[PDB]
Amino acid sequence: DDCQVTNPSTGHLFDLSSLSGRAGFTAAYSEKGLVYMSICGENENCPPGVGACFGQTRISVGKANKRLRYVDQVLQLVYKDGSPCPSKSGLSYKSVISFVCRPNRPMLISLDKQTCTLFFSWHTPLACE
């Protein structure tokens, strides 16, 4: 799709395209590590097609896409089909990136080792109606 989504109640159109680009961003990981991440497309520091990856290793924590969704005033991307999960049988990492209205850096708030899901939050004016 197009890195946009509408609030189906108000018809307000959200667009995260200004955050897009292969240069992307970083989020702090653990004591001194990081995750490279681009919005609505692959990150240049990551393998081809990969929207987010660990800084130390460039191992993928999810394939980029631009499928933006709206859920209870939050905008969300989900990058799935990352690298094999070091914990799980046949699971792959995924990254859930949640944008919340801020009246501008992604944060890694939780890593679910059981499902190899990384949860990110990004407080940004772009998620405000």
Side-chain angles (χ1 to χ4, degrees), residues 2-87 90-101 103 105-129:
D2 48 6
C3 206
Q4 307 177 358
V5 74
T6 282
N7 175 0
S9 288
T10 83
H12 179 98
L13 172 73
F14 299 95
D15 194 338
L16 284 196
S17 277
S18 61
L19 295 184
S20 68
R22 297 181 73 260
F25 307 87
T26 66
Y29 170 53
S30 188
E31 209 60 33
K32 351 201 195 133
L34 57 86
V35 171
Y36 288 114
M37 163 192 353
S38 284
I39 302 311
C40 290
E42 76 183 14
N43 184 263
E44 66 181 352
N45 303 292
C46 299
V50 171
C53 70
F54 288 113
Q56 187 69 24
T57 62
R58 311 308 167 88
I59 289 168
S60 176
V61 289
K63 291 186 207 174
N65 62 63
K66 339 188 214 195
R67 283 246 21 147
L68 191 59
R69 287 159 189 111
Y70 182 86
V71 187
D72 293 319
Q73 295 64 63
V74 181
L75 311 171
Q76 191 169 84
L77 295 161
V78 176
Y79 292 171
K80 52 164 157 164
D81 299 320
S83 66
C85 178
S87 352
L91 301 177
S92 299
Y93 279 103
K94 68 166 199 256
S95 288
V96 177
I97 311 160
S98 293
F99 303 80
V100 175
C101 163
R105 134 82 144 249
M107 286 233 15
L108 174 58
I109 58 178
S110 195
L111 194 154
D112 187 43
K113 274 194 192 149
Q114 269 210 109
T115 54
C116 278
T117 302
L118 277 70
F119 290 95
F120 295 91
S121 65
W122 192 331
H123 293 256
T124 167
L126 289 176
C128 302
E129 289 211 342

